[PDB]
From a paper:
Herein, we describe the structural characterization of AIH from Medicago truncatula (MtAIH), the model legume plant. The enzyme is responsible for the second step of the AGM pathway of PUT biosynthesis, that is the hydrolytic conversion of AGM to N-carbamoylputrescine (NCP) with the release of ammonia. AIH belongs to one of the seven types of guanidine-modifying enzymes (GMEs). It is a member of the pentein superfamily that is characterized by the propeller-like arrangement of five repeated motifs that form a narrow channel with a central, negatively charged core. The monomer of MtAIH is no different in this matter, i.e., five motif repeats (I–V) are arranged around fivefold pseudosymmetry axis that is aligned with the catalytic tunnel in the core of the protein.
In this work, we present the high-resolution crystal structure of non-liganded MtAIH and the structure with the reaction product analog—6-aminohexanamide (AHX). The envelope with twofold symmetry restraints and ab initio electron density map that was calculated with no information about the molecule symmetry clearly correspond to the MtAIH dimer in the crystal lattice where two subunits are related by twofold symmetry. It is worth to note that both crystal structures, MtAIH and MtAIH-AHX, present different crystallographic symmetry with one and four chains in the asymmetric unit, respectively. In the case of the unliganded structure, the dimer is created by a crystallographic twofold axis, while in the MtAIH-AHX complex, there are two almost identical dimers in the asymmetric unit. One is the gate-keeping loop covering the active site (residues 291–314), which is a linker between repeat IV and V. The other concerns the fragment 122–136 which belongs to the repeat II, where α4 is located. The gate-keeping loop is very variable in plant AIHs except for Arg301 and Arg306. However, in both MtAIH crystal forms, this interface area between two subunits is preserved and, taking it together with SAXS and MALS results, it is, in fact, responsible for the formation of MtAIH dimers.
Residue numbers in the entry:
A (entry chain A), B (entry chain A): 12 to 103, 112 to 129, 134 to 293, 300 to 374
Amino acid sequence: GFHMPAEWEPHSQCWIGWPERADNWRDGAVHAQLVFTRVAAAISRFEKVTVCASSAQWENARNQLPDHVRVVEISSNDSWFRDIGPTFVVRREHRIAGIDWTFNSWGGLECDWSLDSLVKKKILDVERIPRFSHSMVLEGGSIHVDGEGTCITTEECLLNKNRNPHLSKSQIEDELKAYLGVRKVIWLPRGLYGDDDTNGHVDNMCCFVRPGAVLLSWTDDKTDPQYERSEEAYSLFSSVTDANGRKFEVIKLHVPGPLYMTEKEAAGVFPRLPGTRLAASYVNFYIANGAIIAPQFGDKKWDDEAIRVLSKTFPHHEVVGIEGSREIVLSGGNIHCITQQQPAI
Amino acid sequence: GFHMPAEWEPHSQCWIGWPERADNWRDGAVHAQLVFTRVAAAISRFEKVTVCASSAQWENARNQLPDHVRVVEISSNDSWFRDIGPTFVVRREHRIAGIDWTFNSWGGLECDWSLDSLVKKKILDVERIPRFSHSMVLEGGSIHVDGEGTCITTEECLLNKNRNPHLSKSQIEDELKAYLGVRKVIWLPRGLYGDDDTNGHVDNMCCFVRPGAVLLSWTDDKTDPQYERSEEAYSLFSSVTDANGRKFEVIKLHVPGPLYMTEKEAAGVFPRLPGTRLAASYVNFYIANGAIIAPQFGDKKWDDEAIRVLSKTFPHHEVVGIEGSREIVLSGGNIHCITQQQPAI
Ligand code: NA
Ligand code: NA
Ligand code: NA
Ligand code: NA
């Protein structure tokens, strides 16, 4: 009787990690920490925030973050709490639980994720919230829900042999149905071009706005490899209905750039290579209570256009652009990847 | 308008650390961890418990402790949360706060306590409880209160030049009055003989049973050096009144032994020396909601007598003796030293 509510439904708080590993974040994560502070501070205007830092980083996080953000000590390999935090479910006796999916470092065998694996159970232990363990590998960034019985995902990620090669698509779909409380799963073939680290997480490709409506990463440039992925997703959405028999409205959200890691950015990481195409999309935003917390990549034309489209799309939410989001995407993710909502009960 | 309530007043939870340092706990703390589990499990029958472990120990603590005990990650140098946890105060607007006294490793300059110093603020941050910082050095084990305006302490500890040599007795007393919400401080000259590590903490010498009544560490052996300390305290209690003008009832609680570290015990620590007299007293018990959690040192005569006296003294509480408490005292403390109550509001 539990289900995953939509991200726009009310939250009691948001969980965020704290970056530090010098081999993934340039210059010892100094720039990324400034942006994590900016994101946490912005979200905290709208809902309570907990930032989780290692022992070595706790004082730094506590100094940078404002007093009304809670700072706890939770050790991790890295700081992508969308994927390593628990996925909370509600039953409207316990009324909230967390799903502890198995983590495997985004298909990483094919190199240590043991601390990251413990993040789900540690957060649930802090909150004294029951844990539902699952042997299936899954990351929260790979699924999206409308809270009304529909889930969207990508085949590129969930059917990759680096995830659950013991399972067929039907078996995976049945676990999503049972654990997320959904009745229909929409399988986009592919996520964002260039998102090789996650194998095409849906949260970088498409998300719900409301039941029956999605934002879709888009480019008007038919010569760019993103075009065929976005067009294929657009065609799928235009050909199917949701779990309640609604047609989809699709709103295009144009990708920046393309953006590429510079020599200076790559040199700061102790592998991240000069010229690497960045997996950048404005779709990787977080919905906080009454707010959209949206990336800004330092590409003025597309940054301003994304704020315009998000403001029109979410007319009852305050849209907040976060300067410096390029510093998150240099390490492979964005605002949605670093957050995990806790639904209110 | 805040004051420290008595330890027998209702608690919302109890905070406990988790031992691990091989240079203070024999055999890598394996024996002490069994006893910390025993104490936490016993307290948890009566009130909620949080055990705080380092990243390296979190899984071990989580395995040993029962499911209804919360396990959080808080780093520390060592695990004496009576002295390194916050002292909570209540105002019956915020109704609870924590005092963050300065810690200095029990006068330790005259050798690293930087992580221990952060424990107070970390616990208050987890709970989102306001923090009152104090520049004065103080450990919670060095004071005891009745919740009705009286505090007892020792001169041996608080007037030692290794604590607050900038302050006179009057200045220290005024800080206790202001921060604990007390109107009279009773200064025992001395704590327990042999308690050189803490310089005679009151919690190993004497504690309140109820307003107007104390338990006092005692020996009938006039040849033992404890006798003159206990007799001096008995005479003081018999000569003064409390903050409300009550005379004191004194109940004697006979020390075990004396007990001495064995060669085998000392050899297990990676300094703790063979033959060291142990600073052992049954006074170092914890009052949980409706329970007395009391040491048992493996000295059958005095262990049984302590349970008899505590059961008579606290007729409305369940007395629970903890087997293996000698393993705590080998490292310089006991059940009261490893706990810190959080008062209910
Ligand atoms: Na701060
Ligand atoms: Na991958
Ligand atoms: Na356990
Ligand atoms: Na000392």
